[PDB]
RNA sequence: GGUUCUCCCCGAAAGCUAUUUAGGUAGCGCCUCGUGAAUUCAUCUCCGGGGGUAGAGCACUGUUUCGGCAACCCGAUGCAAACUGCGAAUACCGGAGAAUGUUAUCACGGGAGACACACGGCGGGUGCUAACGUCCGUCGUGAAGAGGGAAACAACCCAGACCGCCAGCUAAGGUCCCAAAGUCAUGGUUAAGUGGGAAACGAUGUGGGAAGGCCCAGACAGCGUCGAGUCGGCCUGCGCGGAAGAU
RNA sequence: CCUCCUAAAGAGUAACGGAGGAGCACGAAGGUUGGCUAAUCAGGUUAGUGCAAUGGCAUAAGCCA
RNA sequence: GCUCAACGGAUAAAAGGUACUCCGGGGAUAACAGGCUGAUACCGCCCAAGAGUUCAUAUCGACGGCGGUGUUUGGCACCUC
RNA sequence: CGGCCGUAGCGCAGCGCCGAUGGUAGUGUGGGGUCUCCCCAUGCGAGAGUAGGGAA
């Protein structure tokens with residue numbers, strides 16, 4: 001489960017999630033799973049998807065995770081009122097914009113990569129599409 | 137080899153470019169050499185099919201614009217962030 | 231270096247003289 | 257009858273059929289493969 | 295040369311700068327037509343509230 | 352159910368007081384700043400808190416000058 | 430808590446600062462009346478300015494993945510309110526010039542009220558990008574604003590009611606009947622009463638489009654027969670399932 | 677009371693919002709003249725600044741007399 | 742000459758109890774119920790690792806995903822002091 | 823001694839540095855949607871990168 005080893009600060013402003021992604025090309029492998037939708041991916045979702053695709057390829061080839069969950073998300077416990085300070089960090093997310101390549105794969109047939117990424121995509125809260133590396 | 141039919145663009149900038157792409161065309165630019173850059177508009181589906189061939193980026197191409205044949209290489213392509221579409225192509229005279 | 235060291239030594243007074251608008255005997 | 261939101265062919269003998277506005281899977285081989293979307 | 299400018303929509307709920315521009319053109323109400331000199335300064339005022347005026351030139 | 356934050360200091364009203372081309376009297380503060388973000392040019396003094404002020408009546412002029420591309424404020428005597 | 434005749438003109442605030450202060454009060458802000466004074470003020474155009482926000486980027490501060498050489502280093506990939514070798518739009522300050530505006534500006538003086546705000550838009554903190562939640566910024570409306578629309582509906586949309594008219598034109602919104610006005614025209618789509626509550630995801634629903642594979646050297650299906658197309662992906666329009674609540 | 681962020685590139689701007697500091701020190705650690713240049717392991721301030729943070733600082737505001 | 746630090750400093754000088762209680766007020770503000778919300782709860786679904794001798798889907802459903810209800814625990818403080 | 827402040831500095835075009843055109847991002851005003859985000863009209867329009875410049 002991915003998490004920054006250290007951070008300058010513990011807690012982060014909510015912020016917003018506008019714009020299109022940077023890192024829209026298959027840069028490392030042959031095939032990629034690209035976000036079409038916008039949202040947050042939790043570290044648990046990233047891990048569930050990783051485990052699904054890794055099992056599907058039977059640990060052949062190579063997988064890259066292009067996203068990293070570096071945004072801490074706080075929550076207030078049950079039965080506490082509003083205010084009294086910001087809540088405690090509970091989990092970590094990556095912000096996803098449309099176009100973001102989430103995962104890449106190499107050293108497998110396309111057919112197997114497509115199946116592996118279909119199984120992974122079913123773990124994710126964002127719509128995705130299969131992409132292939134391009135020359136330009 | 138690769139014959140691209142193009143027209144010179146009448147309007148430029150964001151408004152004009154988005155209107156082109158809504159009408160199943162896309163903007164492009166020819167530069168290089170010494171003659172000034174030529175802003176052109178291409179048919180989307182035609183070029184999208186051509187550039188699926190790997191030799192589109194390697195080999196010299198011909199852009200037939202206003203009758204004139206201009207010989208060029210593909211220098212850069214801007215793809216749509218998630219759809220299988222072309223936003224823009226840079227062609228260098230070559 | 232000797233020259234660059236001397237240029238550094240010279241600069242403050244030179245900048246002051248320019249500030250004052252002084253005619254300079256270098 | 258399996259009543260599910262996701263109905264699919266489970267083998268090569270499964271057939272998708274729409275009856276009275278309902279997507280169904282009928283299978284000649286396996287009665288367990290009979291499905292109705294619902 | 296002069297141009298005729300008519301107010302086509304209400305000033306109610308418009309930004310303060312837009313109301314100040316209508317005042318600068320001397321438009322007082324919907325359908326009010328004014329005759330103004332055709333100058334860049336006047337054309338800029340029209341441009342600023344183009345959505346609620348019409349020019350007869 | 353308590354915070355160890357909740358503190359801040361009073362805002363210091365720093366920044367540019369007279370912009371380019373503004374006509375000033377001698378003594379007029381041009382910029383309040385921390386350190387020399389702007390440096391004193393001709394007819395401008397630098398106070399103990401790095402306040403730049405006019406030493407002559409005239410027009411404020413901003414300029415980038417010298418080998419470090421530093422920002423200088425001058426008064427064009429007017 | 431209550432505060433008694435009439436008409437005319439103008440018309441707030443629910444903020445800042447301080448307070449044994451927090452539903453009180455004071456100065457300032459905003460209202461009114463009077464007096465006085467400059468092209469004083471506003472809009473636009475042009476000119477002079479400083480920005481470090483949006484966006485972007487990764488040299489720096491941190492964080493991050495892969496590879497080459499587990500550090501450094503080199504190449505490739507991202508991320509940041511408290512990162513910046515970049516950097517807008519706007520906004521703001523100043524100058525000049527028209528036109529317009531009942532001086533709209535500023536100063537001083539008489540009289541205040543107000544210092545519980547609300548919702549909506551945009552930018553945010555907080556909260557669960559929960560709340561008709563909460564806290565700022567900024568604009569709008571309500572407050573203190575009637576009329577028309579949104580079935581009904583302070584705060585949304587249109588629009589600012591001096592009085593009278595059994596005249597006329599329009600706005601938002603509408604034109605089959607309730608109910609004023611097209612059972613209007615032309616070309617399409619939908620068969621779900623979708624329209625008129627709808628998510629992952631599922632499916633030979635159905636319209637359009639761009640490529641393709643195979644095909645009279647006989648494909649495709651069914652049974653060598655066989656005699657025309659067939660096959661399955663992509664993109665897109667509109668529908669279908671997913672869909673259980675209490676008079 | 678101070679510094680940063682929130683704060684929407686002038687100023688200002690709230691919350692039991694996010695992070696840290698102060699209630700001193702110094703007759704030199706002040707004035708001035710003259711001189712000088714760091715960390716790190718070649719480099720070029722990655723050091724330094726009496727004490728937080730931010731902005732500054734080589735003509736040094738840093739270091740020595 | 743002030744940790745007058747509650748830092749624009751009520752006095753030089755000050756702690757508690759009241760279920761024995763009392764007055765003026767407030768739905769400006771809590772406890773009930775309603776309302777808004779739906780984190781939580783409950784219910785349903787998607788993916789299918791795997792269990793099920795063999796076999797994912799008879800039965801069950803890890804890692805994760807999407808909804809519905811108003812239905813528990815709560816949030817808010819809009820109605821009524 | 824200055825102006826200028828990397829097209830000007832290093833190294834011995836290899837770097838630094840400068841840098842279009844076009845597109846993209848953002849955004850003022852008006853309008854719209856399926857509204858956590860976008861789109862349309864109009865105005866403004868980066869950053870990065872590309873061609874190129876460049877041994878003041």
Ligand SMILES: CN(C)[C@@H]1C(O)=C(C(N)=O)C(=O)[C@@]2(O)C(O)=C3C(=O)c4c(cc5ccc(CN6CC(F)C6)cc5c4O)C[C@H]3C[C@@H]12
Pocket residue numbers: none
């Ligand atoms: C008040 N008014 C603007 C509308 C109105 O007049 C009516 C009415 N019946 O007359 C309404 O029903 C309304 O009040 C209302 O209740 C609405 C909704 O509840 C509503 C609407 C649209 C939505 C679209 C998407 C989503 C998705 N949700 C947001 C997130 F939580 C997931 C929710 C909607 C929704 O709740 C229509 C309005 C119309 C209102």
Ligand SMILES: CN(C)[C@@H]1C(O)=C(C(N)=O)C(=O)[C@@]2(O)C(O)=C3C(=O)c4c(cc5ccc(CN6CC(F)C6)cc5c4O)C[C@H]3C[C@@H]12
Pocket residue numbers: 625626627628
């Ligand atoms: C037709 N009528 C029943 C209502 C109505 O009169 C209005 C109106 N403005 O007058 C509507 O807006 C309405 O027609 C309408 O469009 C609605 C919605 O769109 C709506 C509503 C509630 C919703 C609640 C949840 C969600 C999201 N979830 C996930 C998805 F699967 C469902 C969407 C909603 C929504 O779209 C309110 C109705 C009211 C209608």
Ligand SMILES: [K+]
Pocket residue numbers: 368369379380381
């Ligand atoms: K001044």
Ligand SMILES: [K+]
Pocket residue numbers: 455
């Ligand atoms: K007061």
Ligand SMILES: [K+]
Pocket residue numbers: none
């Ligand atoms: K007065």
Ligand SMILES: [K+]
Pocket residue numbers: none
């Ligand atoms: K607001």
Ligand SMILES: [K+]
Pocket residue numbers: none
């Ligand atoms: K009003």
Ligand SMILES: [K+]
Pocket residue numbers: 622625
């Ligand atoms: K219906």
Ligand SMILES: [K+]
Pocket residue numbers: none
């Ligand atoms: K000394």
Ligand SMILES: [K+]
Pocket residue numbers: 747
């Ligand atoms: K006090």
Ligand SMILES: [K+]
Pocket residue numbers: none
């Ligand atoms: K007592």
Ligand SMILES: [K+]
Pocket residue numbers: 785786808
């Ligand atoms: K369900």
Ligand SMILES: [K+]
Pocket residue numbers: 796
């Ligand atoms: K089985």
Ligand SMILES: [K+]
Pocket residue numbers: 821822
């Ligand atoms: K009560």
Ligand SMILES: [Mg+2]
Pocket residue numbers: 150151
């Ligand atoms: Mg636009």
Ligand SMILES: [Mg+2]
Pocket residue numbers: 276
């Ligand atoms: Mg039947």
